[PDB]
Structure formats: structure tokens, C-alpha cells
Design a protein around this ligand. Structure first.
Ligand SMILES: [Mg+2]
Ligand SMILES: [Mg+2]
Ligand SMILES: [Mg+2]
Ligand SMILES: [Mg+2]
Ligand SMILES: [Mg+2]
Length: 195
RNA sequence: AACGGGGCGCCGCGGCCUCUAGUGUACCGGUUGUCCGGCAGGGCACUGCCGGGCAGCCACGCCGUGGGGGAUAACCGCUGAA
């Protein structure tokens, strides 16, 4: 379809300061300062016109096709996620599932390490990025907290994918005659806010 | 079974000659037949033949011969609207 003009509005919440700066012909840099910290995002080569209006961010498209009109909801969702990150934060939870070999997960510094995964002598080591806090709850839960939902979710995805094997090392998901197979690893169980 | 850790080959490539092996009509010795009168020394038998063998060359000998980064393929995921 074709759109002569479309507009969307994201209401800025209390205590959150938004700055929008034009760094190019169609580029934007957005800074969101909240109680929990600061978030910075870039929107490059975009048809969406972003502006500020008395506590709201206005997103506008003029003479847009479907591919340009779809960007309004995406930018709205990104801005809402940034606001919720600076206000309440983000906290992703992961579960540690083992069948015979317990997987010792530990956070030392900005390395997170998994030992004894399936009895492997090798140890999985992951570099925790800036602005992500990793905590190990008991022998079964992992918590990743931050103010960037994309960064926190990406790190949780990396943690889950570290325990998934590929190639010839991939074990059979199901057992003999249809039972459960060797399903061992760390599974992202969900998300919530810090506050 | 596997990841991970330790050890070593085979194939190829590039060098080297210390060792070992080959050659080595440089060199040294033994010996057959005949000629130089005999001994000695020697000619020829196309090194006469046999044994050893420096240097050099050489392999059948020795030495070196790697991890990493980037963008990616097949795809696997995060966020995410229409
Ligand atoms: Mg060679
Ligand atoms: Mg000889
Ligand atoms: Mg004589
Ligand atoms: Mg004569
Ligand atoms: Mg002769």
C-alpha cells in the first residue's frame, strides 16, 4: 500500500530525559537518561522523522511505502524498550539443565565460565560486556541484568547458545525409542524488570 | 563415544652435508697376461681387474615447514514492526 502521511507518538515517562541529534542527512542519535543510567541508540539511513514535543517523541513518515511505514512501530517499540530500560531495567533469567554431569557456572570478574558441561574437560568462557551484570543463583539459575534490553537479551542468547552443540558433537535430542535424549544446557526462561 | 590436554608419524614444499649410504677414471694398495734383460719402476689389456677411499655432489640422511584477524556461505539467534 501507499501512505501519504503517518505519525506515531511515544510518551516519555517521568524522570527520563531524551535528546535527539541529527548526525547526517537521515541519521539520528538518541540519548535517554534515566535514574538507572544512560542509553544511546543510533538510527541510520532512516526515512522516519524523529522529533520532540512536550514530553513525547513524534515519529513521522511522509510519502512512505509499506517498507518505510513499517519502521514506525519498530522505532516506537525500540524507544519504549529504552525508556523501560532506563526506568525499571531489564533482567533475563536462565535455567541450568543437566542429566548426569552438573555444570558448574561461575562469574569471576567479567568472564563467565561453565565447567563440566556434559563432562567435557574444556570450559566455556564468555566475556561479559560493559553494562551487563551476571549473577549465579544457587546451582540452577543465572540472572543477567542491565539497562539495554538488546544487550542483555543478546548476552542471554549467547549463554544459551554456548550449551548447544553443532556438527558431529550434536547429541540426539530424543532417546531410545522416542524417550528424552541428552538435553543438557542453559535455557533462557524469561525476562522481567529489575524494579 | 565426544570437547579439551600431551606425544609422534605419512604426503608435499624449501634448505643442508654433521652422521649414515652411494659415487668418487683425485689418491693408496693387491693381483693376472705380456713387453721394457732380471729386482725396482713402468706401457697396454679403453681405470685390465679387485679392495679401500679425502674433497665435492648426492638421499636411502639431517633441518624448517603457524596460529591469528576481517568480511562472509549454508544457516543459527537477538531485538522488532508492517
Ligand atoms: Mg628435497
Ligand atoms: Mg672405487
Ligand atoms: Mg717388478
Ligand atoms: Mg707397447
Ligand atoms: Mg689404460
Amino acid at each position: 500500500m501507499h501512505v501519504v502521511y503517518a505519525v506515531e507518538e511515544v510518551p516519555i515517562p517521568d524522570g527520563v530525559k531524551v535528546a535527539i541529534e541529527k548526525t547526517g542527512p537521515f541519521d539520528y542519535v538518541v540519548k535517554v537518561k534515566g535514574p538507572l543510567g544512560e542509553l544511546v541508540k543510533e538510527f541510520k539511513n532512516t526515512p522516519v522523522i524523529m522529533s520532540l514535543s512536550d514530553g513525547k517523541v513524534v515519529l513521522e513518515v511522509l510519502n512512505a511505502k509499506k517498507r518505510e511505514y513499517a519502521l514506525l512501530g519498530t522505532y516506537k517499540g525500540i524507544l519504549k524498550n529504552m525508556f523501560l530500560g532506563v526506568t525499571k531495567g531489564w533482567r533475563y533469567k536462565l535455567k541450568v539443565i543437566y542429566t548426569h554431569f552438573p555444570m558448574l557456572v561461575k562469574v569471576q570478574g567479567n568472564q563467565l565460565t561453565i565447567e563440566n558441561f556434559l563432562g567435557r574437560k574444556s570450559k566455556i568462557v564468555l566475556e561479559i560486556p560493559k553494562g551487563v551484570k551476571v549473577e549465579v543463583k544457587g546451582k540452577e539459575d543465572i540472572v543477567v541484568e542491565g539497562i539495554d534490553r538488546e544487550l542483555v537479551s543478546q548476552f542471554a542468547a549467547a549463554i544459551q547458545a554456548a550449551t548447544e552443540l553443532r556438527g558431529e558433537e550434536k547429541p540426539s535430542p530424543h532417546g531410545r525409542e522416542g524417550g528424552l535424549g541428552v538435553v543438557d544446557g542453559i535455557y533462557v526462561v524469561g525476562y522481567e524488570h529489575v524494579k
